[PDB]
């Protein structure tokens, strides 16, 4: 575990 | 579309967390698991835009990023998450669409998923509860990304 990438499209 | 990327210290997706039920079908499609970080995310924005999201002309995609701890060493995640932020913005020019990115912290982060949203959701819920833009966390699960930029811009009045 290194990093959490939250993505937030529409 | 409400994704998270955990990712480990080789970049690659090593799960994918669905923040909101609408990810769940991008996730089906993009299959990010075991994918490294450039072709995961550009899998999410690439399955968004075809699932009528987001439309080319107007999209907005909000990057949050977290350096959960698993790796650190002692000044590697400083560095860390601008190898992360600069990838973040890459696969969007990728995609070719628009981006905000705001890096998220780790109590941010636990803090996201309390509130029942991706961090990216949550980086500009915060931003917008704290500009004086009324925002209630149904608003957060169901207003747009470009709904809560457009508001920021019209309103601003904090830091």
């Given at each position: 575990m290194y990093a959490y990438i939250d993505v937030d499209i529409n | 579309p409400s994704i998270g990327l955990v990712i480990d210290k080789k970049e690659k997706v090593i799960d994918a967390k669905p923040l909101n039920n609408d990810a769940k079908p991008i996730l089906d499609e993009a299959a990010?698991?075991?994918?490294?970080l450039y072709d995961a995310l550009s899998k999410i924005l690439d399955i968004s835009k075809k699932n009528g999201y987001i439309n080319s002309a107007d999209n907005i995609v909000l990057f949050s990023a977290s350096i959960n701890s698993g790796r650190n060493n002692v000044s590697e995640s400083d560095k860390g998450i601008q190898e992360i932020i600069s990838t973040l913005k890459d696969v969007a020019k990728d995609a070719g669409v628009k981006f905000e990115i705001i890096p998220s912290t780790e109590e941010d982060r636990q803090k996201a998923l309390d509130q029942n949203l991706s961090m990216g959701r949550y980086a500009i819920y915060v931003k917008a509860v704290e500009e004086?833009?009324?925002?209630?966390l149904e608003d957060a699960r169901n207003l747009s990304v470009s709904e809560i930029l457009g508001k920021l811009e019209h309103h601003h009045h904090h830091h």
């Open positions: - | 990010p698991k075991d994918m490294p004086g833009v009324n925002l209630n």
